[PDB]
Amino acid sequence: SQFIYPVQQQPSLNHFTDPNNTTVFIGGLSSLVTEDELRAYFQPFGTIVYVKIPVGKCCGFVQYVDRLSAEAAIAGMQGFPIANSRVRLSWGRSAKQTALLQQAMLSNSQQQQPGLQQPNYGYIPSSTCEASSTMLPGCQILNYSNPGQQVIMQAVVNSTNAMLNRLEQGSNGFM
Amino acid sequence: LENWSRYLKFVTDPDKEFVMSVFDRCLIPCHENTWMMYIKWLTKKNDEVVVDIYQKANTFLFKTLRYDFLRFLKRKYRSNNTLFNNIFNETVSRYLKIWPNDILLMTEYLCMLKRHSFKSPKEILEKQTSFTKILETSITNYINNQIDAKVHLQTLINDKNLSIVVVELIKTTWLVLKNNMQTRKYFNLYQKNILIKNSVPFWLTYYKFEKSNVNFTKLNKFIRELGVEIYLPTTVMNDILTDYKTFYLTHSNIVTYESSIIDSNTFDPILYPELKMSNPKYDPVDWHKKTEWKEAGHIGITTERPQISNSIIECNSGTLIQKPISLPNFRNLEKINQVKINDLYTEEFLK
Amino acid sequence: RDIVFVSPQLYLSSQEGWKSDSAKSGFIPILKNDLQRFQDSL
Amino acid sequence: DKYTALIHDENFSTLTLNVSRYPKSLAYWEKLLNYIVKASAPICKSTEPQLLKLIRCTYSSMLNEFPYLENYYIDFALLEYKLGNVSMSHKIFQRGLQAFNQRSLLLWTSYLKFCNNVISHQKQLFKKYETAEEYVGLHFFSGEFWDLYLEQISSRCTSSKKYWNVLRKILEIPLHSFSKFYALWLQRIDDIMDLKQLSQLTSKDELLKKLKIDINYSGRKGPYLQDAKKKLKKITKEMYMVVQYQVLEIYSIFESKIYINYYTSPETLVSSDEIETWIKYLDYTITLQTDSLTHLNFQRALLPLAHYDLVWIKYSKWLINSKNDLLGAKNVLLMGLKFSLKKTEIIKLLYSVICKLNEYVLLRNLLEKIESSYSDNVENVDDFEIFWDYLQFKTFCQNSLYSSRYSDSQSNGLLNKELFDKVWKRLSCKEKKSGQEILLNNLVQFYSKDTVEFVEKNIFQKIIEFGWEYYLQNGMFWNCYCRLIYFDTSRSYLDKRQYIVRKIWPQIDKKFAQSVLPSLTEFCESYFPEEMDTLEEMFTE
Amino acid sequence: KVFVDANRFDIGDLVKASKLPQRANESRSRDETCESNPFPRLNNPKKLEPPKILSQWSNTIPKTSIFYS
Amino acid sequence: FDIWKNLDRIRSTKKFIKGSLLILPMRTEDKQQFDECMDELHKYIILRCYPQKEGMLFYIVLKDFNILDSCFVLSVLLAFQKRLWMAPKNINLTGSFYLPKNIETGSSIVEVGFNVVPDFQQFQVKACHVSKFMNELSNFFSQVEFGKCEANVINYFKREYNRTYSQISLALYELPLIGDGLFDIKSYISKTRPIIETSKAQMIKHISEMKAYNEI
C-alpha cells in the first residue's frame, strides 16, 4: 500500500549508541583529584556503582545506575573545572570491556551492559540514598545503597544527619 | 587461603608466640586482614613488639591498615616520646610517596604535632601565637619555595595540602585570640591564589566564619558566585546550600530579605539554593545553534536536526487564514543521517 | 430523602459540616445509618 | 420505587460503607458505580428523579475526587446526555477540560465528536475547534483530532480555501500519524488542475519569487501545469523529510518506551524505565521551546505520573528557570500539592517559591493550615521533614513579625518562648520520634552573648539536670554543646578552655566509650590537642 | 464503557438494535473495574506501533537509527 | 515616593474602557487595619470590595474606570501589602491582578502561563519599583480592550476561587492520612507486595550481573 512501517539500520555498538551505558567519563582530570573526591563530585546526581581512575593518565570513570543520572551528570559537568582546569565529559565504555578493547587494538579487531529487565514498579530514578512498610507511590520504596552494595528500602533525616556530621568535619580533613 | 583461615581459626581456638610465628609464616605466603587480625591478637596478649609488627606491616604493604596503624598508635600515645618519633617517621614515609597527596592524614599530623610541641595564661598566649608563627612562615615559605630543615615544613606541601595548613592557620588565628582582622587579611590573601581556592575545607571554614559574622551580605556574595567562581564538590555544594537555607530562615526576617532581593535581574536567596540545588553551572538572566539543542534528548551525539524556518506551528488557524501562506524555508536539510561525535573517550583514554 | 452526603477528609480534619444532606461538592453518599461508618474510622 | 428498592437492599449499604471509609480506593468506588447503574434500569427520563440525582451526585463526587479521569468524564457527560439536558453536558465536558487545564486530547476528541452533533452555528463551532487546536493540536498522538477537524472542514465549507490552510498547517506539526495527512495532501496536489488555484494553495507572490510559477500564463498550460505539480512535489519532499526525521526521532527515542498513558488509579505504580523515559521526554521538549508543545507534554506526562512528585517539581523548576513567569510555578505547585502523595518536597518548594513571590500572608495562612491539618501537635508526626520545613518557614514569618526581643543579639531566631515549647516537645521525646539531634545544630549555631547564655541555660542545662538516656549518650549532643560554647564573640580563649573541661566533666564521667568518645574525641582532636591529652586521661580511668 | 462501542449510553442502544437478524447458524462490558488489570506491565502488552510512512518517500528516511533495540 | 504625585506625573505623560473590569484578591491577616485603610481610600475617592469568610479574602473590582483611577488604586494596595511586613520610597511591590481573558492586547507585568482560575488570565506583577510599575501599568492599560461579560462575574469568581483553595485545604488536610486511612492499605499491600518482592529480586540479580560485567 502507500504506508509501510519503517525499516532503519543498526549502528555500531561503540559507547554512544544503545543507551544502556551509564559510565560517565571525565577527561582532563588533574592529579589532585583521585578516587574519593570524584565520588564526592558525582554522587548527588544518582547512585554510583563505582569510580575508577587509572593513575597513569588524566582520565576517570564513574558509573551511575540509571541513564537519567548519567545524562543529568553530562549536562551538569561539561566544562566544569574541578580543583584545577576544565573537564571534558563523554560516555566511558568502562571497565573490563576497556581491557578487551585494548586487546582488540592489539589484535586489530562490543557488549551492551544490562540496563534492567522489564518493570520494577519499585524504583524511582536519580534517587540518592544515604548510609514500617507502607509502600506508596510517593514512598519510593526501593533504593540502591553503596558504601558491598545492596538494595534497601525506606529517611531524609539520615541524609540530613550525614550532612551535618559531614559539615562539622568539613572544617578539618577526615575526608 | 582457606587452609590458612582454618589454621588461624584453630589458633583462635587455643605457645602464643609460636602461633604468631605460624601466622607470620602464613602471612609470608600472603593479606591485610591477616595482619590486622594478628595485631588484634597481639593487643589481646598485651605493645612495643606490636609497634614493631605494625612497622613491619607498613614496610610489607593498603590505605586502611596503615591509616589504622597511625590511629591506633596515637591511642597509646600519652605513654612516651619514642612512639611520637616512631609515628612521625611512619607518617612522613606515607606522605612522601606511598600516599602522595591525600587530605586525610595531614591534619592528623598537625594534631599530633601541637600536642607534643605545645602543652600559665600568658604562657599559653605566647605559646599559641608561636604556634601561629610556625604555620604562617610555612605558608609564606611555600609561596617562596625555600623549604628548610623542618620535616613538618617539608610534609606541609604535597599539592592538596596547603589547603589544610591555611585552614588550621585561619582557624587558630580566629578561634583563639578573636583576631578577626588578620583572619580577613588571610582570606583576601588566599582568595587570589589558585591551588588554595578550589579547596574544600578552606571555603568551609570561610562558611563557618561568615556564619559567626552573621552579616548576610557577604554570605549572599558567597552563594551567588559559588557554582561559577568557587568551583567546589557538589555533595559539598548541596550541603552548603541547604545549610545556608536553614541558616537563613533561622536568622532572617522579611525586611532584610526584600532588601537582599536584588532588583530586576538576579537570584533570590531562598529560591536560589532551592532551584540551584544541583546544576552548578547555572546563571540567572540566538536559537538553535547551541550545543544543548544539537545534542538534545538523544544526548549521545551532536546531530544537525533539520528544522523549517517559517514554520507556523505556534500560530492558530485563524491568524493562518488571515494571510495566504508563504512557502517553507528549509534549514540544514542535508545533514539527514549525519552523525557527529566528540569521541573524547576513545581519543584521549585509549590513544 | 433518607440519604446524607458525607466526606471523611473533613471529618478526620474535624472541620465542621462533614455531613450535609444537600450535595455540596464532593461528599460521598451514605444512608441515614451513619454510625457504623462513624465507628469504622476512629 | 426502585429508588427506595435500591436503598433497602443491603448490598448498597455495605458497599457504601466500604467506600465512604476509603476515598482514594478506586476499586471500591468502581463497585459503587457498577452497582448503582447496573442495579438501575435502562436509563431514560422515565426513571425516578431521585435515582437520577443519585447518579449525578455520585459521579460528581467521583470526578471531584479523581480529577484526571478521562473516561469517567465521558461516561458522566454521555449518561447525562442520554437523559437530555444538552446544556448540562456542555457544562460537564467544560468542567472536565477545566480540570485538565484545557488539555489532553481525549476529552477534546470526544467533546468535539459530540459537539459536531450538538452545536449548529458554523463560525462559532469552528472557533471552538480553533480554541481546541491551539491547546491540543500539537499533541503527538493527536491525529484523530485533526482527522476529525479535516473531515469536518471538508464537510461544511464550499470554498476549499479554508481546508488548504489546515492542510498546510498539519504537515509542519510532528504528528504520529502525519503520513495520512501527507497522503491526503499529496492526493490534493494531484487533483488540482486548473492552475489558478495554486493561488489558493499558497500566496501568489511567494509562489512566484521562491518557486517560479506564473498563475497568469498565455500558453498551452498542459506541460506547464504538469511541471508545476512536479515542481511542488519537491517542496513537499523536503517538508516531509524534516517532519519525518522529527517524528522518527520522537518515536524511536521516547514513544517506543512509553507504554502507559492513561492515569489508572493512584494505587497503581509506574515502572522505573518508564519514569526514565518520561523525564527525558520532558527534558527533550524543553529544548524545542514551542511552548504549547511543552505545556502539553508536561500536562500530558502528568496523566500516568500524576502524583509521584517527580513531574510536578520538574514543571515548577522548569517554569522558574526557563520561561520566567515565576507565579505559574506557584500555581502548578499548588495544583500538585492538590495531589502528590509525598507532599514533603512539594510543600518545601512551594514555601520557597512563595517566599520569592512575597505573598507572605499566603505563607502564614498555609502554615496555620498545616497546624489545623495535623489538628495541632506538629511535633508528633513521624516524618521529620514536614515538621522541619514547617518549623523553618514558620520561624521566618514569625520572627519577621514579632521581633526585637533579644537586645544587641537580634535575629529572633527560633527562640519564641512558644516556639521554644514547640521545639522542646519535639525534643523531649527520647527516641520515640526521629531526628532529634538536627534541631540542636540549628540551635547551637545561634551565637554571641545574651543567648548562648540563654540557650545554654534554657535547653542544655535542663537537659543536663534531667538527662534522658538516649539523648544524653549520643556523641552529637556533647559535640554541639561544646560547639555552641566554643564559637562566641563575647569571650577569650582561656575561659573557653576552662568551660570546655567544665562541660566534658559533669554528665559523662561514666561508661559511654562506644558512644561519646568517638564523636567527642573528633571534636577535641579537631579544635586543639592539649585537653585531648587530658580528655583521654579522664576516659582511660 | 466508553470506547467499546455500545456501552456509551448515547449511541449505546443503537448497536444492540442495529444488530441484524441472525437467522443463519454460526464484549468487554461495564463489569470491568480497576482491580481487573492491577498492573498492566506485568502481563506484557505489545509496544506502541511504529508510525506509518509513504512508500513513495520510503527511500528518504534517516538510515541507521541511533540506539538499536 | 508619593502616589498622587506619580499619578499626576502620568496624568501629564499619557494623553475609560467599554466594559472594563479588574478583579484583585487581597490577603491581609489583620482584617481591621486593612479596613482602616481601604475605607480611608474610598473616603479619598467603582471599586467594590467583596469579602469572604485571618485569611480575609477581600476582592477589589474595578469597573468602567478612567485609566489613572486604576493607576492610583492598585499601586496603593500593593504598597499596602508590603507595608505591614517591612516597617509599619523604599522596597517595591509584588503581587498579582486578574483580568477576564476576554481581551485583545493590540517585562514587569506578565501574562501568567497556567492560571489555576477558570477564564481569568492571571497577570502577575514583577519586582519593579513604584514609578516604573506605574508607567508599565499605564502603558499596558493603554493597550487592552475588553468585551462585556458582566453576568455578576465576581459571584462566579468567588465560587471558583474558593472552590480551588478549599480543595487545596482538602489536600492539606489529607497530609496526616496519606495512605493509612484515605485508601485501603491491606487490600493494597495484598497486590503490591509480591510485585515489589519480585522487583527487589530483579534489582539484586541486576546488581549481581553488574558485578560480573564490571569485574575481571
Contacts with F127 from chain B: Cβ below 8 Å = 261, 263-264
Q: Does A2 touch chain D (CB under 8 A)?
A: yes
**How many CB atoms are located within 10 Å of the residue D356 CB?**
25
C-alpha cell at B334: 542535508
Closest residue by Cα to residue D145 from D106, D102, D103:
D106
How far lies D191's CA from each of A145, B287, D166, D184, D225, in Å? 65, 39, 17, 11, 11
C-alpha cell at D538: 579522664
Residue D330's identity, in one-letter code, is K
Instruction: Kindly determine whether residue E34 and residue D244, on different chains, have CB atoms separated by under 8 Å.
Output: no
Beta bridge partners of F125: F95, F109
Render the burial of B201-213: b for 16+ CB within 10 Å, e for the rest: bbbbbbbbbbbbe
**How many CB atoms are located within 10 Å of the residue F189 CB?**
14
Burial class (CB in 10 A: 0-12, 13-18, 19+), D440: buried
3-state secondary structure A90-114: EECCCCCHHHHHHHHHHCCCCCCCC
The strands making up F121-125's β-sheet, listed across from edge to edge, are: F47-50, F56-63, F21-28, F95-99, F121-125, F109-111
Residue pair D307/D340 in contact by the 8 Å Cβ criterion: yes
CA B329 to chain centre: 53
| Closest CA–CA distance from residue E58 to any residue of chain B (Å) | 14
How far lies D111's CA from each of C24, D62, D85, in Å? 26, 19, 15
Interface B:E, Cβ pairs < 8 A: 12
Residue pair A106/F188 in contact by the 8 Å Cβ criterion: no
Place of cell 591485610: B32
Coil, strand or helix: which one is F122? strand
Residue pair F74/F97 in contact by the 8 Å Cβ criterion: yes
C-alpha cell at D340: 502528590
Angstrom distance (rounded) from CA B270 to CA D246: 40
Contacts with B306 from chain D: Cβ below 8 Å = 241-242, 245-246
Burial class (CB in 10 A: 0-12, 13-18, 19+), D479: buried
Q: Do chains E and C touch (3 or more CB pairs under 8 A)?
A: no
Using N-to-C axis directions, what is the helix angle for B48-60 and B82-93, rounded to 10°? 10
How far lies B276's CA from each of A38, A157, B223, B270, F172, in Å? 20, 21, 10, 10, 27
Contacts with A116 from chain F: Cβ below 8 Å = 202, 206
User: What DSSP state is assigned to residue D255?
Assistant: I
Q: Does A17 touch chain F (CB under 8 A)?
A: no
Place of cell 517506543: D256
DSSP letters for D39-79: HS-S-STTS-HHHHHHHHHHHHHHHTTSTT-HHHHHHHHHH
How far lies B92's CA from each of A136, B51, D88, in Å? 55, 16, 86
Strands F21-28 and C28-30: unpaired
Instruction: Kindly determine whether residue B333 and residue D162, on different chains, have CB atoms separated by under 8 Å.
Output: no
Instruction: Kindly determine whether residue F113 and residue D328, on different chains, have CB atoms separated by under 8 Å.
Output: yes
Place of cell 532588583: B263
Coil, strand or helix: which one is A51? strand
What is the enclosing helix (H) or strand (E) of C29? strand C28-30
Residue pair D522/A174 in contact by the 8 Å Cβ criterion: yes
Instruction: Kindly determine whether residue A170 and residue B200, on different chains, have CB atoms separated by under 8 Å.
Output: yes
Angstrom distance (rounded) from CA D109 to CA D146: 9
Contacts with D20 from chain C: Cβ below 8 Å = 6, 8, 28-30, 37
What is the enclosing helix (H) or strand (E) of F120? none
Place of cell 494571510: B323
How far lies D471's CA from each of D439, D467, D516, in Å? 13, 7, 11
Closest residue by Cα to residue B252 from B222, B220, B276, B283:
B220
Render the burial of C1-34: b for 16+ CB within 10 Å, e for the rest: eebbbbbbbbbbbeeeebeeeebeebbbbbbeee
Residue pair D74/E2 in contact by the 8 Å Cβ criterion: yes
Q: Do chains C and A touch (3 or more CB pairs under 8 A)?
A: no
Closest residue by Cα to residue D413 from D423, D425, D398:
D398
CA angle D351, F165, F35 (to 5 degrees): 90
Angstrom distance (rounded) from CA D134 to CA D292: 7
DSSP letters for A7-43: -------SSSSSTT--EEEEES--TT-TTTHHHHHHS
Alpha-helical runs (H) found in D142-193 = 144-156, 161-170, 178-191
Angstrom distance (rounded) from CA B137 to CA B147: 10
The residue length of chain D stands at: 541
Chains that touch E (3 or more CB pairs under 8 A): A, B, D, F
| Closest CA–CA distance from residue A121 to any residue of chain F (Å) | 7
Angstrom distance (rounded) from CA D330 to CA F95: 12
Residue A74's identity, in one-letter code, is I
Angstrom distance (rounded) from CA B189 to CA D495: 31
How far lies D303's CA from each of B303, D221, F13, in Å? 31, 55, 50
CA angle D80, D86, D91 (to 5 degrees): 80
Beta bridge partners of A153: A142
Residue D380's identity, in one-letter code, is N
Using N-to-C axis directions, what is the helix angle for A156-168 and D384-401, rounded to 10°? 60
Angstrom distance (rounded) from CA D331 to CA D319: 11
Beta bridge partners of B331: B307
Number of H helices, E strands in chain E: 1, 1
C-alpha cell at B192: 587570589
Coil, strand or helix: which one is F65? coil
Closest residue by Cα to residue D164 from D128, D124, D207:
D207
In angstroms and rounded to an integer, the radius of gyration of the C-alpha atoms of chain B is 30
Using CB atoms, pick whichever of B124, B246, B333 lies closest to residue D494: B124
Angstrom distance (rounded) from CA D284 to CA E40: 26
Angstrom distance (rounded) from CA F46 to CA F67: 12
Instruction: Kindly determine whether residue F124 and residue D369, on different chains, have CB atoms separated by under 8 Å.
Output: no
Place of cell 502616589: F3
Using CB atoms, pick whichever of B300, B301, B337 lies closest to residue E62: B337
Angstrom distance (rounded) from CA B169 to CA D121: 84
Instruction: Kindly determine whether residue A95 and residue F210, on different chains, have CB atoms separated by under 8 Å.
Output: no
Closest residue by Cα to residue D499 from D510, D489, D508, D491:
D491
C-alpha cell at D2: 426502585
Instruction: Kindly determine whether residue F108 and residue B255, on different chains, have CB atoms separated by under 8 Å.
Output: no
Angstrom distance (rounded) from CA D393 to CA D351: 7
Segment B153-157 long-range contacts (CB within 8 Å, at least 24 positions apart): B154/B92, B155/B91, B155/B92, B155/B95, B155/B106, B155/B109, B156/B106
Alpha-helical runs (H) found in chain F = 3-13, 31-44, 67-86, 130-141, 153-174, 186-214
| Closest CA–CA distance from residue B215 to any residue of chain D (Å) | 11
Residue pair B66/B94 in contact by the 8 Å Cβ criterion: yes
Angstrom distance (rounded) from CA F118 to CA B306: 38
| Closest CA–CA distance from residue B310 to any residue of chain E (Å) | 23
Q: Does A95 touch chain F (CB under 8 A)?
A: yes
C-alpha neighbours within 13 Å on the C-beta side of residue B156? 29
3-state secondary structure chain B: CHHHHHHHHHHHCCCHHHHHHHHHHHHCCCCHHHHHHHHHHHHHHCCHHHHHHHHHHHHHCCHHHHHHHHHHHCCCHHHCCHHHHHHHHHHHHHHHHHCCCCHHHHHHHHHHHHHHHCCCHHHHHHHHHHHHHHHHHHHHHHHHCCCCCCHHHHHCCCCCCHHHHHHHHHHHHHHHHCCCCHHHHHHHHHHHCCCCCCCHHHHHHHHHHHHHCCCHHHHHHHHHCHHHHHCCCHHHHHHHHHHHHHHHHCCCCHHHHHHHCCCCCCCCCCCHHHHCCCCCCCCCCCCCCCHHHHCCCCCCCEECCCEEECCCCCCCCHHHHHCCCCCCEEECCCCCCCEECCCHHHHHHHC
What is the rounded end-to-end Cα distance, in angstroms, of chain C? 27
Residue F34's identity, in one-letter code, is F
Residue pair D259/D289 in contact by the 8 Å Cβ criterion: no
Instruction: Kindly determine whether residue F95 and residue D359, on different chains, have CB atoms separated by under 8 Å.
Output: yes
Instruction: Kindly determine whether residue D343 and residue F178, on different chains, have CB atoms separated by under 8 Å.
Output: yes
Backbone phi, then psi, for F99, in 5-degree steps? -135, 155
C-alpha cell at B132: 601561629
Positive or negative torsion for Cα B310, B316, B319, B320: positive
Find the closest chain D residue to C35 by CA distance: D17
Beta bridge partners of A26: A60, A89
Residue B225's identity, in one-letter code, is E
Angstrom distance (rounded) from CA B337 to CA B324: 33
C-alpha cell at D34: 457498577
C-alpha cell at D325: 513567569
Residue pair B204/A170 in contact by the 8 Å Cβ criterion: yes
Residue pair B258/F91 in contact by the 8 Å Cβ criterion: yes
Strands F109-111 and F21-28: unpaired
Coil, strand or helix: which one is C28? strand
> Could you tell me which residues come within 8 angstroms of residue F130 by beta carbon, excluding any fewer than 6 positions away?
F1, F3, F6, F75, F79, F92, F93
Does residue B289 come out as left (phi exceeding 0), alpha (psi in the -120 to 50 range) or beta? alpha
Coil, strand or helix: which one is D317? helix
CA D308 to chain centre: 8
User: What DSSP state is assigned to residue E36?
Assistant: T
Find the closest chain D residue to F174 by CA distance: D373
C-alpha cell at D422: 514547640
Contacts with F126 from chain B: Cβ below 8 Å = 264
Place of cell 481487573: E36
Contacts with F123 from chain D: Cβ below 8 Å = none
CA D477 to chain centre: 39
Residue pair D301/D104 in contact by the 8 Å Cβ criterion: no
What is the rounded end-to-end Cα distance, in angstroms, of chain F? 75
| Closest CA–CA distance from residue D338 to any residue of chain C (Å) | 13
Instruction: Kindly determine whether residue C12 and residue F170, on different chains, have CB atoms separated by under 8 Å.
Output: no
Burial class (CB in 10 A: 0-12, 13-18, 19+), A51: buried
Using CB atoms, pick whichever of D126, D289, D393 lies closest to residue B287: D289
C-alpha cell at B331: 534549514
Instruction: Kindly determine whether residue A165 and residue D526, on different chains, have CB atoms separated by under 8 Å.
Output: no
| Closest CA–CA distance from residue D24 to any residue of chain C (Å) | 11
Method: cryo-EM
Q: Do chains C and B touch (3 or more CB pairs under 8 A)?
A: no
Residue A144's identity, in one-letter code, is Y
> Could you tell me which residues come within 8 angstroms of residue F123 by beta carbon, excluding any fewer than 6 positions away?
F96, F97, F98, F99, F109, F110, F111, F112
Place of cell 506605574: F134
Angstrom distance (rounded) from CA F8 to CA B265: 29
Angstrom distance (rounded) from CA D487 to CA D445: 8
Angstrom distance (rounded) from CA B38 to CA B3: 16
Alpha-helical runs (H) found in D192-221 = 198-201, 204-211
Positive or negative torsion for Cα B212, B215, B216, B220: negative
Angstrom distance (rounded) from CA F154 to CA F161: 10
C-alpha cell at B150: 623542618
Q: A 102-131 residues with CB below 8 A of E?
A: 118-119, 121
How far lies F162's CA from each of B80, B249, C5, C24, in Å? 78, 30, 20, 13
The residue length of chain C stands at: 42
Contacts with B270 from chain F: Cβ below 8 Å = none
Beta bridge partners of D335: none
